[PDB]
């Protein structure tokens, strides 16, 4: 037999509208239509009737725009932060194929779509045909990006750190806030070097923090290891950093989204001595999605 009906959604601007990609589990890359905060979502729900002769008794058809956060792969933990309904049909029958127009006016989409370890945040259209014991349901996923402009203030991070009477260094990264295709321009300056350093590297680290209060899991992922020095410096030695962020395709910083989760980035400077002892200093950076002109 198969299914009695097949629900398809088609957006009015489905030719001209730009799509986007998302890295899911096991390296898969799904591509969905891109939307921005305040845009209207509108199109057609198309019901293809598959079994001619037969009839489809329903207690109503609707379409929902949904944006929700999912935690720990646990259906019971899902929280919808945006829900909009359009009733498409009263209780009735369907003998043949039909299509329904829908339009959600100027839809609020306060968060950027995210897929992480313990958190997903996704938007979708959910068409539902209500039936006596089991509803026919069709989801249609959308990416939403959240944009921003050049920040009012953007101070360079500059800091002396060390091990007392062994190693003193001053490091500097040119900004505190970097866009997703920006560049870490920085330097390391050696004030005192009484250890034998083999190499130094700059790492970019992604932390994903989930939960509330003492309920706090953190998932750390090291997105880049970038060697910046090879060999032992002396005092007065400057080491240039130029790390292009386009090569690692990171997400923006996301801070207390719906008071549920955060995702934050960190430049972890790591030196390593001849006996493989490892000295480090972590610094948060804000990543942000630049609005194209």
């Amino acid at each position: 037999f198969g299914p009695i009906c097949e629900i398809d959604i088609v957006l009015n601007d489905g030719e001209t509208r730009k799509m986007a990609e998302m890295k899911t589990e096991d390296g898969k890359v799904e591509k969905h239509y891109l939307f921005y905060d305040g845009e209207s979502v509108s199109g057609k729900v198309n019901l293809a009737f598959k079994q001619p002769g037969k009839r489809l008794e329903h207690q109503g058809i609707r379409i929902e725009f949904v944006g929700q956060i999912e935690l720990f792969n646990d259906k019971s933990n899902t929280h919808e932060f945006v829900n909009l309904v359009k009733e498409l049909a009263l209780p009735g029958e369907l003998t043949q194929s039909r299509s329904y127009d829908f339009e959600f006016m100027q839809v609020e989409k306060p968060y950027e779509s995210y897929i992480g370890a313990n958190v997903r945040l996704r938007y979708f259209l959910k068409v539902t045909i209500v039936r006596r014991l089991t509803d026919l349901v069709k989801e249609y996923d959308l990416i939403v990006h959240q944009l921003a402009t050049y920040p009012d203030v953007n101070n360079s991070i500059k800091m002396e750190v060390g091990i007392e009477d062994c190693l003193h260094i001053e490091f500097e990264y040119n900004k505190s806030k970097y866009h997703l295709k920006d560049v870490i321009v920085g330097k390391i300056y050696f004030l005192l070097v009484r250890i034998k350093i083999q190499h130094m590297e700059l790492q970019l680290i992604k932390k994903e923090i989930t939960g509330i209060g003492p309920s706090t899991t953190t998932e750390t992922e090291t997105i880049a290891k970038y060697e910046i020095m090879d060999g032992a410096p002396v005092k007065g030695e400057s080491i240039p950093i130029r790390l292009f962020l386009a090569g690692y395709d990171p997400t923006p910083t996301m801070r207390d989204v719906n008071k549920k989760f955060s995702v934050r980035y960190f430049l972890n400077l790591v030196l390593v001595d001849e006996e493989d002892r490892r000295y480090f200093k972590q610094q948060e950076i804000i990543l942000w999605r630049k609005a194209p002109e």
């Binding site: 500097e172 040119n174 560049v183 321009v185 920085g186 330097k187 300056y189 007065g236 030695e237 400057s238 240039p240 130029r242």
Partner: peptide
């Protein structure tokens, strides 16, 4: 682009 350095 590089940051300016103090000569050694």
């Amino acid at each position: 682009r590089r940051l300016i350095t103090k000569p050694q």
